[PDB]
Amino acid sequence: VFLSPRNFGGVPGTGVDSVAAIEAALAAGDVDLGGEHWFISRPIYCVSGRTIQNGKISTLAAQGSGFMAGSIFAPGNYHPVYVDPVPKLACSSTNGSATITVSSHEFVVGDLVRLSSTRGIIGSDAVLVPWYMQLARVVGVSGDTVKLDAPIDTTETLVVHKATPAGYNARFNKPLFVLERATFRNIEVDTWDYWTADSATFECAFEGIRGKARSVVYGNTFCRTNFDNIDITFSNKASEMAFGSHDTNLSNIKFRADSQNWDSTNSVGISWAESGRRCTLDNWQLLVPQGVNLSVLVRISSHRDVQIRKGFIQVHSSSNNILSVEHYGGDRPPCNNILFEDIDVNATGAAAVVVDVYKSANDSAINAVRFEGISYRGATPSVALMRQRGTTSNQVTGVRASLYSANGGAFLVSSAMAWDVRLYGPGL
Numbered sequence: 001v002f003l004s005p006r007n008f009g010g011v012p013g014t015g016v017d018s019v020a021a022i023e024a025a026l027a028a029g030d031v032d033l034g035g036e037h038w039f040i041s042r043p044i045y046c047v048s049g050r051t052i053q054n055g056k057i058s059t060l061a062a063q064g065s066g067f068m069a070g071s072i073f074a075p076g077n078y079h080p081v082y083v084d085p086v087p088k089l090a091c092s093s094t095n096g097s098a099t100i101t102v103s104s105h106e107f108v109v110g111d112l113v114r115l116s117s118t119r120g121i122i123g124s125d126a127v128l129v130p131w132y133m134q135l136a137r138v139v140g141v142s143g144d145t146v147k148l149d150a151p152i153d154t155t156e157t158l159v160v161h162k163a164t165p166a167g168y169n170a171r172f173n174k175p176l177f178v179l180e181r182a183t184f185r186n187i188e189v190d191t192w193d194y195w196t197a198d199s200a201t202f203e204c205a206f207e208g209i210r211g212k213a214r215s216v217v218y219g220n221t222f223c224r225t226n227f228d229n230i231d232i233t234f235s236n237k238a239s240e241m242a243f244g245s246h247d248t249n250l251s252n253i254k255f256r257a258d259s260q261n262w263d264s265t266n267s268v269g270i271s272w273a274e275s276g277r278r279c280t281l282d283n284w285q286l287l288v289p290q291g292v293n294l295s296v297l298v299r300i301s302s303h304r305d306v307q308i309r310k311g312f313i314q315v316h317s318s319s320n321n322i323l324s325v326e327h328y329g330g331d332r333p334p335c336n337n338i339l340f341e342d343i344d345v346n347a348t349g350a351a352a353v354v355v356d357v358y359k360s361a362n363d364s365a366i367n368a369v370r371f372e373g374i375s376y377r378g379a380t381p382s383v384a385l386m387r388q389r390g391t392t393s394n395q396v397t398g399v400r401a402s403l404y405s406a407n408g409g410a411f412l413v414s415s416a417m418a419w420d421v422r423l424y425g426p427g428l
Contacts, residue, residue: 001030012036043071053185070193076179076200082170084127088159112163117156133244135223222248235261237268246277253284269297276303290316299324311343318349329361342373350379355386371401385409388416
């Protein structure tokens, strides 16, 4: 808002590095990029309580400079490997209660803290992905009694540590932190890389983000965060919100897949996992042009309390899987209370499966899943309009759908029961 990088020796528009200048202004105050074009040699390390707005940021780093080399911001910098060695204290906690007991804590009122379960899986980073994760602010302390600004929503045994734990480093030996109460407004990003890679946010707002990147909404530990009016041409992954993202809302989002710069290796549509809670996507388009093929457009694995609403999907390929809820069991928190509502799906090909529900294991948990107002425009699916698969002992139960498919399609069930699926033809 108030200060310019120019005031800290920053030069725009000539392809010289300004990262230090931007970071210097961020330390002093809010930052207005003057509607000019800034060039950075590495991600801007963000500052809690700051607004950055009104300009374009391009990376100077060469494609394949290494992970996060091309990134625009480190809005926080959590990655499971750097969170893993942080010492974490045992605490008592009760499902529904904002009160914990922690022997020999050093939390003060106002401190952001991270609550996590000791239950979890070893994930892609070869480290614990807790069954449950929560950032919350301390609002009271008396001896071992700590009060939080939000309840604990699990019966799981938790441990706690300072969200920003002094002495502990992350990538490029920068301190491990969560970005608090920061705002990003009217920014154009221009990178080959994740415009954010490592990240962790709490009460942050991204408003008016446009341009080109590997990704549209991608990062770790997005908490009490809003993403609004995001319109990005992406080359690999529409959205992942990993490592315990919760109470985070995406609205007015245009995921435009990049035909020229498409990277087909490990392509991801919207893929939500790593114990997310109360994450919503509302009013969005996923546009996959000719020449680009995403195998799975929207999938939820390891997310709960999810709402995906007011969606348009257009793909220019065949045999895509459109909407998917999956659970691989073990110590993955259940895929519970998932609403897909008012999704129009166009395919120039013929979808494989439009609605999929898949329990891989005897201990897989999928409950209170609804697919309401799903319109599929395209040829009769090659596998199924709608497929449910459980196991003999672990059936898919209670699933609900309203589907509008002018070319109909197969209704495949395999160890599933107690569904309620209305099919409507065109013309009301």
